[PDB]
């Protein structure tokens, strides 16, 4: 702010002001609020809580069976070298 003498800035907005209204009042709000609809315990989703496999491992079962059977052919006898 600058004040300049001799033209000085009025020393106030004075008493000639026009009170325009008495509408100043905010009427307090008084209220009762009830949000009470029956609630049912459940919601349907496509899927909740699953941690789906991105790849599975290979998996398997097992079997064996049979017996011990055989047809054989042997090497001929040979002269013994030494000993």
């Amino acid at each position: 702010a600058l004040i300049n003498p001799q033209f000085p800035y009025a020393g106030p907005v004075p008493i000639p002001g026009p009170a325009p209204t008495e509408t100043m009042p905010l009427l307090n709000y008084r209220v009762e609020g009830r949000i009470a609809g029956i609630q049912q315990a459940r919601q349907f989703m496509p899927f909740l809580q699953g941690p789906h496999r991105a790849v599975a491992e290979q998996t398997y079962h097992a079997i064996g069976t049979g017996i011990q059977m055989g047809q054989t052919f042997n090497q001929p006898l040979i002269n013994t070298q030494e000993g």
């Binding site: 052919f73 042997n74 090497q75 001929p76 040979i78």
Partner: protein, 38 residues
């Protein structure tokens, strides 16, 4: 890969069972073989 070798599995033979046999018929045998330290 598995050469015929008697003494490894008894005598072995090459077999031909002919359907027709003309006069003077015969089998001409050709062999390729190794004969090592033994």
């Amino acid at each position: 890969d598995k050469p015929i070798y008697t003494l490894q599995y008894g005598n072995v033979g090459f077999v031909v069972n002919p359907k027709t046999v003309n006069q003077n018929a015969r089998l001409l045998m050709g062999y390729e073989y190794f004969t090592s330290r033994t």
